[PDB]
């Protein structure tokens, strides 16, 4: 929750609407659909890039800790999972002597990694929610929650809650749902999704 709340503010502030309203961006600057596509793809290379990697890493760690993977089949299973979840193949073969996942900082320093997954969703579930109280009409990526007191009050109703109540109840106070949902992310990236589908006709 902490990082999602921190991140939605930056997501809204980076919009060209707030930039042209703050004076940094000249008012005589109309955003072309090409620039919107470029910005969406730059965002996706981070947001949608990290999701399969995070999910695969956490699944491998859970399967190791649960004993489903034998100690002599770790790297085999790891590079098997990476070839069908992340879609990434190792350039050179690795035996059980390697510990490639341990080369990551969060693995060798004993940090839970699933946090970076849910945080990627929650923010969008927040953002898509906060644009409803802000009465946004256009695409989600152009939404700005500024100047709208209703969205701020809806957010604060959960912010003041803290840990006193279950996180599901906190979600229902903003997104109106008890379980995490991925539909806001797809709604956010739909303009990029259509363009990507159109660009891959022959590939
Ligand atoms: C919010 O209100 C201020 C005050 O009039 C205005 O300057 C600004 O353009 C409005 N919109 C945004 C996105 O800041
Ligand atoms: C932007 O819209 C124009 C008008 O339909 C179109 O010709 C152009 O291909 C579009 N570009 C992108 C990146 O969507
Ligand atoms: Zn932070």
Secondary structure (DSSP) of 90-126: -SS---TT--GGGGSHHHHTT---THHHHHHHHHHHH
Ligand 1 and 35: CB distance under 6 A: no
Q: Which long-range contacts (CB under 8 A, 24 or more apart) does 160-166 make?
A: none
Alpha carbon nearest to ligand 1 atom 8, residue? 21
**SS3 at position 45:** helix
Ligand 1 and 61: CB distance under 6 A: no
Mutate to test the pocket of ligand 1, among 147, 148, 149, 151 (most ligand atoms within 8 A of CB): 147
Alpha carbon nearest to ligand 1 atom 6, residue? 21
The tokens for 6 are 């921190």
Nearest ligand to residue 6 Cα: 3
Close Cβ partners of 21 (under 8 Å, ≥ 6 residues apart): 146
Ligand 1 and 144: CB distance under 6 A: yes
The tokens for 8 are 């939605």
Q: Do 138 and 197 meet the contact criterion of CB atoms below 8 Å apart?
A: no
Neighbour count for residue 68 (Cβ, 10 Å): 9
Obtained via which technique?
Answer: cryo-EM
CA 155 to chain centre: 19
Q: What is the CA angle 150-126-35, rounded to 5? A: 100
Close Cβ partners of 57 (under 8 Å, ≥ 6 residues apart): 101, 104, 107, 113
Query: Which residues are placed with Cβ below 5 angstroms of ligand 3, an ion?
Result: 3, 6
Ligand 1 and 142: CB distance under 6 A: no
Q: For residue 161, how many C-alpha atoms fall within 13 Å in the half-sphere facing its CB?
A: 20
Q: Do 17 and 144 meet the contact criterion of CB atoms below 8 Å apart?
A: yes
Nearest 5°: phi and psi at 31? Answer: -80, 120
Dihedral Cα 127, 130, 132, 135, nearest 10 deg:
-110
Nearest ligand to residue 5 Cα: 3
For this experimental structure, what is the resolution in angstroms? 3.3
Nearest to 11 by CA among 116, 118, 122, 176: 122
d(CA 14, CA 35): 13
């Amino acid at each position: 929750f902490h990082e999602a709340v921190g991140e939605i503010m930056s997501l809204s502030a980076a919009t060209p609407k707030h930039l042209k309203s703050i004076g940094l961006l000249s008012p005589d600057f109309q955003e072309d659909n090409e620039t919107e596509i470029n910005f969406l793809l730059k965002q996706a290379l981070t947001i949608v890039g990290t999701l399969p990697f995070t999910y695969m890493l956490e699944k491998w760690r859970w399967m190791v800790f649960k004993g489903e993977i034998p100690k002599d089949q770790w790297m085999k299973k790891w590079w098997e999972m990476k070839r069908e979840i992340v879609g990434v193949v190792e350039p050179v073969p690795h035996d059980e002597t390697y510990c490639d996942p341990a080369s990551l900082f969060h693995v060798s320093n004993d940090y839970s990694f699933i946090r970076y997954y849910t945080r990627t969703l929650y923010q969008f579930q927040f953002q898509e929610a906060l644009c409803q109280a802000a009465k946004h009409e256009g695409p989600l990526h152009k939404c700005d929650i500024s100047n709208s007191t209703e969205a701020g009050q809806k957010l604060f109703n959960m912010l003041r809650l803290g840990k006193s109540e279950p996180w599901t109840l906190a979600l229902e106070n903003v997104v109106g749902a008890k379980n995490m949902n991925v539909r806001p992310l797809l709604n956010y990236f739909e303009p990029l999704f259509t363009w990507l589908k159109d660009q891959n006709k022959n590939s």
